[PDB]
Design a binder for these strands. Sequence first.
RNA 1: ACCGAUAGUGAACCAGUACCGUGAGGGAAAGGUGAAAAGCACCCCGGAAGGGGAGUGAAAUAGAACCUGAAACCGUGUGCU
RNA 2: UGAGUAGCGAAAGACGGGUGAGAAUCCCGUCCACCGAUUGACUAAGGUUUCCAGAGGAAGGCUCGUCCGCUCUGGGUUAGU
RNA 3: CGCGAGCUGGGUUCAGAACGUCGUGAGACAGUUCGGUCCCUAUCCGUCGUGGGCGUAGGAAAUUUGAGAGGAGCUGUCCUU
RNA 4: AUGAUGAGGUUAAUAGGUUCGAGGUGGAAGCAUGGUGACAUGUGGAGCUGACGAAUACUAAUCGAUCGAAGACUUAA
Lengths: 50, 161, 111, 44, 114
Amino acid sequence: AVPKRRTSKTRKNKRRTHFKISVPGMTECPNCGEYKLSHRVCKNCGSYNG
Amino acid sequence: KKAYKKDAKSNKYANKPAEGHAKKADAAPKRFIREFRNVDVDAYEVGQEVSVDTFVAGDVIDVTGVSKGKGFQGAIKRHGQSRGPMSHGSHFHRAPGSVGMASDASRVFKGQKMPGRMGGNTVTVQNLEVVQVDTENKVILVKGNVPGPKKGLVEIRTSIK
Amino acid sequence: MEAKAVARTIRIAPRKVRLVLDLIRGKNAAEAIAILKLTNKASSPVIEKVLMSALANAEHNYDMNTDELVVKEAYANEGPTLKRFRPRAQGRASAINKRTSHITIVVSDGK
Amino acid sequence: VKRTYQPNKRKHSKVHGFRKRMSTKNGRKVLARRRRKGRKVLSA
Amino acid sequence: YRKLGRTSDQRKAMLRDLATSLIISERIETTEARAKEVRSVVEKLITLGKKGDLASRRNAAKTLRNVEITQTALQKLFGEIAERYTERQGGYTRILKQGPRRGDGAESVIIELV
RNA sequence: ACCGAUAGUGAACCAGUACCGUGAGGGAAAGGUGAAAAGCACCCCGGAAGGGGAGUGAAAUAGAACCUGAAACCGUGUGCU
RNA sequence: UGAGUAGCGAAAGACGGGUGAGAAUCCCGUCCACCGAUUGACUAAGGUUUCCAGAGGAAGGCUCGUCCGCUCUGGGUUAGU
RNA sequence: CGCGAGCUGGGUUCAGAACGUCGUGAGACAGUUCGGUCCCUAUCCGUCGUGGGCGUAGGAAAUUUGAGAGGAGCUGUCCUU
RNA sequence: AUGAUGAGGUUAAUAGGUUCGAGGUGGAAGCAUGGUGACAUGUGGAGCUGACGAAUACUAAUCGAUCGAAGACUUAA
């Protein structure tokens, strides 16, 4: 159907309380020196070594 | 379970509270701690093995286990509702019927049967019998078929009737 | 002190961008670029550009160490929307808002 | 579905053309009226 | 095993294609679901190639496209690929998660022969 | 003791024009940098756009989406709850 | 606002190698798949440069785009029958 | 005469056609008969499932009591006295 | 549905592979033989086998990181 009453800009923000996106869950590569994403190949330099 | 560990990242290993609780009894940490009322307390606070030999064949039993899960199963499958006609120009096949009266109720009553998650309940069966208590293989054979999947925990006790 | 970088008329919706900007606000500048490279979102690359320009403006015009620069602020503001039209059915037609955004980032040593 | 406009150069100029307008008193009134308004394109 | 967003014989075709591409190239960058599924398909052909008989060559021939390398793919398998993996008892591949893809967000992995 | 850009002509702007119609015919929206282009040389990030400095300038939050720049609306921060 | 919601217009794609600032999509290749009284070859009406090559990636393309029926810059139509 | 944003659309009062009857007529039924597009993507309350935040004066893991709420509750026929 | 609930994360049987089974189909290819041929018999309950049972670290569950207390105030015993 159609909305019977326009939504306040309070109820809106409450409903968007959970419209987050978490961080990826990354770590630092002990070889590359930088941040990789855990259980993935290192972006910067090469290896996985797991 | 195994003993306490420091990696201990999967629940295959007891944790320290569980081991304090089980070491009170001088018994290894254990999965599936369950309480039994209705038994006159005549066992030992020190844990002695309760062998299946407590049960004789010609007795009668009730067997509690969680039901088997079936997720979000709709009205016809979950509540045994009838379905609409299929062929005489009908657009109502498997949906619920009406969900109330018109404007003199003005709302849906609690307990209205609607689609949702099905199964998984703690259901109990009653008056089952024990065909055979196989000791030294440590199994019991019950007359029928009990709630729960395979490997599903089931607590057996004597009938309340 | 403080060094800012603004990217204007970036053709992405602003509430498709504030999703990502709500992460790197308050963070260090190293983990900020780490996140902005690792995230799946489509706003990451443009925000990578903008945050790197902020850090470069710091280390070239204001000369503050690019080791302690924390992202003091980061925010998107609306921009000029391109209003388009889409043919619905039965002769109708519905608007479309190809909206934009202005992405401002402000890195400061905190001193 | 078959829509109303099936284009045809010959039909278009033979019915709405210039010479067909000028070959009538009423078509000439139409041309005069469109010149009066200031139309860039008098006839079809 | 797991349906791959495809119809039945379309899925069969995709799996045959990937197993041929793998034993031709020795490593391919694919999607993690496709890699999980091809892992249990390209690894039942190396078994047939470690057997070596005529019946094994034909059971392998019915799950393997024709592409010449010059050799075939089947000669590649019952020839020089099956000999390298002569000692190990299964586990002839691996998957390496590259990470998310652009345009999809698809989880891209690199599958390969060990 | 007429209007001052939703006004005044439909048209202050290359307007009976975009566009609409087979056709007769209908028909808009579109003004303002600066006193002077003096309209941003050079450096840095960037693939460019776009910026941050550095300069022009009386002013650049007057940088050609350029006089002021309201409200709806969208945000970031924080005192009381 | 509804709301990051409905949709994203019938259909098989896969991998490799490139180009690239950036590739599910652009190029080349191999395999596979679909039409085949037609999804093929040719022409009338109609359209009126959409044709080709070099360059581009603001807007258009229902996503992406290094691509294009889009943009820029140069070219293309030859009759006694 | 519960329930068509849950379903049908047979009759009922749409446009066709015909019968009896009435009307000079166009047409009307006391009628009767054959044919005849049933739109919606759920904002709020409501209900059915299922998660997170904080709380329960330290942080936890496990086992529970049960205030209260819900379910179930039907009956036949044979033989014996 | 997702999240959640469970079983694990190598100091490991969680999944896949490998090897054995069960069950399913029903006698694989090759060869030989018998027929001129369609075909038939043996080799041989053969061969193939998704989800089921075991066993085996061969591949992958790497290295890592985030959160999370040190216990308020009165009276009474």
